[PDB]
């Protein structure tokens, strides 16, 4: 079975976010600009295995594209994709922390949710995302895992 | 090397892998399970796989579930020719119950590279 | 390559493998054992093995015994040079007792391919 | 390649390997731990590793501790990129308590060779 | 030390079952057709490790040849080798079932005995083996594992 | 960052014990004869990773050199290095035993200490080492592991 149409929106928004042109993505993915257009513009549906290619093309782990789709399948929209900049920033700290700190590595369940828990804890404390650093986010991360 | 899989039901999640150099693909449950303390469950994933040649699939434990909730993976050898439903035998050795929900991460699938050697009897082996 | 073994006693069964592409060889007990619940026994096979080069022997669980009778395999690293009696450390985590009879299949032997790397200490590693 | 490591504290022992053809390097605890029966502990080694390419690090059980004191190793997958403090998840399945002292051997580190395969969905697989 | 004489009988019967000549076996997995004939006739004993070679030659898993010998060592004859056609038919279902069904894969102990248990269950129900299909045998198989 | 000076003494004593000339070890390890002399003579300190080389050159497991150093750091001298012959003799029995007997293989904790426990048990019973054989030592070894 083929993939929902909103993956077009997801690929499209994230293309504009990574400051990538359809031509540049066409070289990375290997699909013609026309194929990418009809994919983004909603005209044809993206195959199950083509998303992995797009992930490499975009440079966003295909794992994450689905978690964004999961937010479309539930909420109707995707708040992560909406304010994706704050997400990309936090996820990269969550990632670095997982692969470099034992408390996180032997305790984390799912980096994606943990990134959201962290962004929600920062909004609750009225703290900007480009105002905190990797060392500060780690202290927060470690609290939310016990 | 490719790892072809196939969904056996609407309830299965495609195997995912975070890093490009991560040891295994995540395996997700397809159903809700409640494993009582000191008990075990064969958690179905509703996917079938075909592993690349020269390896078998090891269903390995997730470090989180193990360190924090005392969850191990029993059995866990997936043969090259196994084409049925990949199931994960979970051991709950904790004092509490453990709750598996559909879409939960419950193991990882590692493609352990192995030999397939021919067996040969001898009188004894030189030590 | 080849996996040479040798019988150490009258009581041993030769390792067998069902398919040509099966992950491990079956290991059979050479004796009767009664493992109480929540207890363990080192089940002797009365065979000695010599693994092909570039691998070690993993004594891995049988999926049947695990899913149906709660039997796990402890330890299970066989070094390349181990020339003694291959034993299988069986854990019975069930609520009942578990019965090993001579000639029962209790584990499988996988030739896990590994590196034998040289170790090198550093001040620190650049973090990822 | 080689297995590069680095001490994270004054308390760490360098991994050692007895034979030239031994399956794993010995891992030593860096602290004292008392594991109650039927309980679990994350034993820190205070070392960080970088595994050679084409493998992951399996934290495997020591046969001695397993047969004589009923000690198993939970979890035990070390990713290629894991650069933090290598920990060993110990399960004490014995009836008594088990005592870890600094400098004790509590596991081995095997460089399991694996594939890093590409995943590819199909409609179904030929049985 | 050399192997019992009945392995000759076993090799002979299974040769005739796979419609294979002594010279064909020598070209598939053998040294000489005369050696194979003296093994089958019981004048020469097959070496310990020669059975694995024969198994590939005949196209029957060597694992099975020994299980047949086990029946000579006990019963004096081998009833499995007697009606081997009904066995080969059932074994191929048991195999297919083991490698394609999780209930079987995570429950079976030994494919060989399970084939015998199944052939004995059909004898008790007076059902021909070439009258049931793979789907029917699976239903029975899963019961005999519960 | 470098290793203590006593590693020179250790390499020196053990060089003289394996009846190897500085020039022979210079080709075994790959260190210039001057490097080894300033290393043994206490003039320059041996790098962290150079001991593994020496162990291969000497044919003594580098694991053991450190266990000797552990005795210098504590006692001030090293009794193992003092009577190293009786150690090498026992260690080779302990080794043979570990790699060839299941009771030892599935029971031993650390071959080095077990060798020391065994040498101390023989001294307490006033038995010389060239009066015992592998079979006698094995019986003793198995007792000290329960
Ligand atoms: Mg385990």
Author numbering:
A (entry chain F), E (entry chain D), F (entry chain E): 8 to 153
B (entry chain C), D (entry chain A): 24 to 150
C (entry chain B): 24 to 151
Question: What did the publication describing this PDB structure actually write?
Answer:
The dUTPase enzyme plays a key role in preventive DNA repair by eliminating dUTP from the DNA biosynthetic pathway, meanwhile it also produces dUMP, a precursor for dTTP biosynthesis. The lack of dUTPase activity leads to high cellular dUTP level, and increases the frequency of uracil incorporation into the genome upon synthesis or repair as most polymerases do not discriminate dUTP over dTTP4,5. Overwhelming of the uracil base excision repair mechanism by perturbing the function of dUTPase induces DNA fragmentation and cell death. In 2010 it was discovered that φ11 and 80α bacteriophage dUTPases interact with the staphylococcal Stl protein involved in the regulation of a Staphylococcus aureus pathogenicity island.
On one hand, we determined the complex of hDUT with the crystallizable amino terminal domain of Stl (StlNT) by X-ray crystallography. The complex was crystallized in P212121 space group, and the asymmetric unit contains a trimer dUTPase bound to three StlNT chains. Based on our hydrogen deuterium exchange mass spectrometry (HDX-MS) results a short segment of Stl binds to the active site of φ11 phage and human dUTPase blocking the pocket from the substrate. Based on HDX-MS and 3D crystal structures a peptide segment of Stl including residues 106–113 directly binds to the active site of the enzyme. In case of the phage DUT-StlNT complex the N-terminal of the dUTPase (residues: R15, E18, N20, H21, D24) serves as a secondary interaction surface with Stl (residues D77, R74, Y70 and Y98, N102, Y106 respectively). These interactions are missing in case of hDUT and LvDUT, as the residues in the matching positions are unable to interact with Stl. In case of φ11 phage dUTPase sidechain of Stl-Y106 forms H-bond interactions with the N-terminal of the enzyme (residues H21, D24), while it has no detectable interaction with hDUT. Based on the crystal structure of StlNT, residues to be mutated (i.e. V55, Y106, S114, Y116) are found on the surface of the protein forming no sidechain interactions with the core of the protein, with the exception of the sidechain of S114, which interacts with the mainchain of D110. We showed that the C-terminal part of the Stl protein omitted from the crystal structure has an important role in the enzyme inhibition as the full-length Stl is needed to exert maximal inhibition on the human dUTPase.
